[PDB]
Every structure is written in structure tokens, then in C-alpha cells.
Amino acid sequence: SKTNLIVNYLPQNMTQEEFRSLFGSIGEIESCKLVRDKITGQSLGYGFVNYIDPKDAEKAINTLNGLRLQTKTIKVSYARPSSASIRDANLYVSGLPKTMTQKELEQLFSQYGRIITSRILVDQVTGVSRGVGFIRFDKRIEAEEAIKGLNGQKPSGATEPITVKFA
RNA sequence: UAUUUAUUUA
């Protein structure tokens, strides 16, 4: 992209001043906004930062993505143009073979579009995959196509079909 | 089985 970034997985405890201070350390900011619930005013876990110089947005991604704050590992990337088309593109998947890795899950789902995020849930105790997870596509239409082409199907070597639905 | 609960901001 260019100068506008979206920062995800922000700690519930982080303040906008800390937000601006952390990203302000990279370079001049034209504006930034820790997103908050319109009624409660509490942080929603993410925010945006728009740099003056695109080279700084690049440096922000290169240096701050993966930074661990409190219980979070923040993610820094380019904000896609705000559009209703990117909303509601998150899927809930179950029945996956527990042998499946996240790399394989994305390879499976990527046939239908650009993946923004993927996550396979694991058991705290045994540590074994639970065969469930989430996949968020770039476009709602891509998620709809994945539901149609993957719900009730059996992946590559699977013996059991999987369920795909909007989160 | 709902995520590092929560990726598009008067």
C-alpha cells in the first residue's frame, strides 16, 4: 500500500497516547486512531496509523510487527481501503484433520481468495490441534465462495468432511 | 469445540 496501516492484537491495557507514542517513534504521523466502541468507549483491540512518509509506514511494519506487548503479539500491516466489501469475511471451520498445519489450511482456502488471517485452535492441556479454527478473507465474496466450495467437503487426504460457516 | 475474544476508523 502506501502510508496507512492497521495495527491488530493490541493489549486491552494500551492507551491511545501509548499507541501514538509507540508508532510515533518510527516517524511523523499525519494521524492515528486507536479504535474504540462507540458506546462504551473501550478499545476494540486494533487501530490505525497514517504516516506522512510511506517509507515510514514500511519501517513501522518492518520493526513493530510481531512486537509482544502484555499477552499480545501485535500485527502491523497495510490498511486496505475502508469498504463494506471487506466486512464480515471471517469464517469458522471445524472437523479439520488434526494433522493439518496452518500452512496447509491457508493453501486449502487460498484457492478462493486472499487470506487476511488464519488460526487453528489448540488444546491448552494436551497441546493437540482441536481441528477447528478461523479464516478471514480479504473480501466477503471470497468467504462466500469458500463456504460453497469447502463446506461439507473432504480436504485432500481427509476421511472426515469439514464445516465452513461465517463466524 | 468462537480465536492473540473482537481487521476498516463521526
The method of structure determination was X-ray
β strands within chain A, DSSP E: 4-8, 29-36, 43-51, 68-69, 72-73, 75-78, 90-94, 115-122, 129-137, 163-166
This structure's resolution (Å) is 2.3
Q: Which of residues 138-167 of A touch strand B (CB under 7 A)?
A: 165, 167
Domains and CATH numbers, chain A: 5-75 (3.30.70.330), 91-167 (3.30.70.330)
The string over A119-153, giving b where at least 16 C-beta atoms fall within 10 Å of a residue's C-beta and e elsewhere, is ebeeeeeeeebebbbebbbebbebbbebbeebeee
By C-alpha to C1' distance, B5 is nearest to A45
